[PDB]
Amino acid sequence: GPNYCFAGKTSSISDLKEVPRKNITLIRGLGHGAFGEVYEGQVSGMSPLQVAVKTLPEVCSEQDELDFLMEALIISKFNHQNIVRCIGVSLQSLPRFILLELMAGGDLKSFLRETRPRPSQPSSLAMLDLLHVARDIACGCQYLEENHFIHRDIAARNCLLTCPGPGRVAKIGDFGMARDIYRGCAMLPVKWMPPEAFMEGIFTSKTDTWSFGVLLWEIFSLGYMPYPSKSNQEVLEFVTSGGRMDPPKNCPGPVYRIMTQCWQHQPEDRPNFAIILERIEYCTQDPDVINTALPIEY
Ligand SMILES: CN1CCN(c2ccc(C(=O)Nc3n[nH]c4ccc(Cc5cc(F)cc(F)c5)cc34)c(NC3CCOCC3)c2)CC1
């Protein structure tokens, strides 16, 4: 049985909150992908608690088994409002379950794509909504940084929202990349990686800073793919040459500046998450920033 260490503390399968299987009802499928397989569920104490349920295939390898356990351990040890909570697990029944905080808004990438301003709904999103999401994720990233946990895959695809409408809170919802390393390839998130990451292969919280800058571009572009028209190798060469993305359409200069400082070639020239947060908050208070209209997609 493997042990997991976070914030100087060691835990194992024993420390996970096993919820009796009979207390868990699957309500509906939500979807599947690189994150695994997710359902809406209910937990009763006998008003039940609405949750998300990630499942482990019954037909699976033993590394698969150990992956699932590790994912459970990693999430259960995080304690932050901008990281999805783990309600508990159900590993003593088959198929195995991890019970997570339900995020009714789905993944951030799809939300931004779906909620683009249009002639029919020309004010579905405003700059302040984008800045609030950015702040939400920076806050989760600051927690990770101060706890010396390197995420390694900060991207819109790995972020979730509490709800579609006003008052949505964005949260880090996937830790698969971090789980894999705790245990180059075509699946590597190259377009989110700093130049030194392909090179001497050393990751720091400043490598997360780089990725956060790319996330920021994703947010302000309303969900576009980074480096449009470039392949992984092309991006890699472009980025290490000093090349950087243009601002997303209608991006205020102050917001773009946060991106460009996140993409400084030298790691020590890049802001930590406390500085990123300060800059986002300043942007949030500047009327010329927040009064800037997002583009209408025709
Ligand atoms: C109109 N939209 C239709 C889709 N709808 C939703 C709502 C919720 C989810 C979803 O799985 N939510 C999760 N809640 N908690 C999770 C924990 C964990 C996870 C896993 C996870 C984490 C992450 F960071 C990103 C993900 F995509 C999935 C999810 C939840 C959801 N999931 C989809 C995500 C895209 O792939 C298909 C399913 C969709 C939003 C409304």
Swiss-Prot record:
Post-translational changes noted in the entry: Phosphorylated at tyrosine residues by autocatalysis, which activates kinase activity. In cells not stimulated by a ligand, receptor protein tyrosine phosphatase beta and zeta complex (PTPRB/PTPRZ1) dephosphorylates ALK at the sites in ALK that are undergoing autophosphorylation through autoactivation. N-glycosylated.
Residue ranges annotated for the Protein kinase domain, each copy included: 24-289
Effect of residue 149 to V: In NBLST3; somatic mutation
Effect of residue 154 to T: In NBLST3; somatic mutation
Outcome after substituting residue 182 to S: In NBLST3; somatic mutation
Residues modified to Phosphotyrosine: 4, 39, 182
Subunit structure: Homodimer; homodimerizes following heparin- and ligand-binding. Interacts with CBL, IRS1, PIK3R1 and PLCG1. Interacts with FRS2 and SHC1. Interacts with PTN and MDK.
Pathological association: A chromosomal aberration involving ALK is found in a form of non-Hodgkin lymphoma. Translocation t(2;5)(p23;q35) with NPM1. The resulting chimeric NPM1-ALK protein homodimerize and the kinase becomes constitutively activated. The constitutively active fusion proteins are responsible for 5-10% of non-Hodgkin lymphomas.
Family: Belongs to the protein kinase superfamily. Tyr protein kinase family. Insulin receptor subfamily.
Protein name: ALK tyrosine kinase receptor
Organism: Homo sapiens (Human)
Gene (UniProt): ALK
